[PDB]
């Protein structure tokens, strides 16, 4: 059971940013949604909730300015944010209560992975994937591209796990962001590449 | 909205450490719940209703506490423990409910000298303007290291960013990625290419280099 999450990646200030959480596999009867946003380098911070009775919370800061609500055939929740500045930038968290309290906090048994939201007029720009060649290391850097996620770097499909070590993106002089992924191995090797918000989707061999 | 302290901890691998959790309002029906954030993840619920482990939370966590005042008690602090913890509360059932502000927490381990690999910029890549050479500090501590790039022993600066991951979850140590980024011009006016790492595990300054072509 999971809450994949779904959102544009970035968008830019005045648009209605919107999100989507689908309950993928079925799981508790009576759940609760709600959603928590992280502002970079900042604690959670409550946007709503909507209970197993469809009972919708806001936080104080959201009453006017967002709408949550359900598509029960497609087991998906909703969450708008309109009027969107630079000060909505995070990273927003959809979480499941399972005593079903549309405003509780105490209790969040299961998380989605996050979508992010950068709020810029900057434009969105693809990467260029370059690689990088008893034990050795190699990687792939997912170089010059922006907004910063969605971003996924898996390597072999997921099989090679152990002494994977992907980096946090920094900001280069470019204005562009550039990250990267390294593998220490014993002396096929394939990095999965996904910008969503370019729809870049590359698999480097290295 | 919820106090928590301290604001970041630091002790060393089996140490008890504390987290306290303080409110203004007291928690309605012992709705207060611990959450442990590992780097690039999701929080994960770790304790609920003051004192509840999560099925699969190791026994080393606990929560104890009423009205007010609670706290997270870690018994054995781990490599794996490095997150920032938060707690949450419910104060009625009307929508009063918040985070805390967080506690960071930092494993102290002995010191360990970083291995460093060195990447020349790939031919895909470089048949854009840019050339990229990767330098890497691979499984150290302490976090404290200093990269200097040099091109044919001359000094760069200005040119190069850099990224550390977060503590280890099994060794508890660190690693470091510089990207140095020249124009393909320069690239191709030069051949050595080396990083230089500074590391207190390291007796003398190790240099990975390598010579283009």
């Known amino acids: 059971v999971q809450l994949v999450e779904s959102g544009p990646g970035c968008v830019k200030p005045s648009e209605t940013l919107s999100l989507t959480c689908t309950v993928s596999?079925?799981?508790?009867?009576?759940?609760?949604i709600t959603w928590i946003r992280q502002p970079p380098g900042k604690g959670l911070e409550w946007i709503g909730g909507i209970s197993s009775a469809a009972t919708t919370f806001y936080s104080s800061w959201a009453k006017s300015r967002v709408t949550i609500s359900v598509d029960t055939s497609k087991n998906q929740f909703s969450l708008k944010l309109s009027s969107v500045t630079a000060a909505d930038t995070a990273v927003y968290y959809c979480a499941r209560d399972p005593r079903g309290y549309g405003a509780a906090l105490d209790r969040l048994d299961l998380w989605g992975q996050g979508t992010c939201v950068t709020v810029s007029s900057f434009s969105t720009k693809g990467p260029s994937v370059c690689p990088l060649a008893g034990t050795a290391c190699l990687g792939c850097l997912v170089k010059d591209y922006f907004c910063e996620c969605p971003v996924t770097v898996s390597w072999n499909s997921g099989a090679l796990t152990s002494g994977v070590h992907t980096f946090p993106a920094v900001l280069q002089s470019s204005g562009l962001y550039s990250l990267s992924s390294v593998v220490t191995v014993p002396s096929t090797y394939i990095c999965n590449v996904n910008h969503k918000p370019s729809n870049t989707k590359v698999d480097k061999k290295v | 909205q919820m106090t928590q302290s301290p604001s970041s901890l630091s002790a060393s691998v089996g140490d008890r450490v504390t987290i306290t959790c303080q409110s203004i309002?007291?928690?309605?029906?012992?709705?207060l719940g611990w959450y442990q954030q590992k780097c690039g993840k999701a929080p994960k619920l770790l304790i609920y209703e003051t004192s509840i482990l999560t099925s699969g939370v190791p026994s080393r966590f606990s929560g104890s506490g009423s009205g007010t005042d609670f706290t997270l008690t870690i018994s054995s602090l781990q490599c794996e423990d490095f997150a920032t913890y938060y707690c949450?509360?419910?104060?009625?059932?009307?929508?009063?409910?918040?985070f805390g502000q967080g506690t960071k927490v930092e494993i102290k381990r002995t010191v360990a000298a970083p291995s460093v690999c060195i990447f020349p910029p790939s031919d895909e890549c470089l048949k854009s303007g840019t050339a990229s050479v990767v330098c890497l500090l691979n499984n150290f501590y302490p976090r404290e290291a200093k990269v200097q790039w040099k091109v044919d022993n001359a000094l760069q600066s200005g040119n190069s960013q850099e990224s550390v991951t977060c503590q280890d979850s099994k060794d508890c140590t660190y690693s470091l990625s510089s990207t140095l980024t020249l124009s393909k011009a320069d690239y191709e006016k030069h051949k050595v290419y080396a990083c230089e790492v500074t590391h207190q595990g390291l007796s003398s300054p190790v240099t990975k280099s390598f010579n283009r072509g």
């Open positions: 949450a509360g419910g104060f009625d059932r009307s929508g009063d409910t918040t």
């Open positions: 309002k007291s928690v309605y029906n012992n709705r």
């Open positions: 596999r079925f799981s508790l009867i009576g759940y609760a």
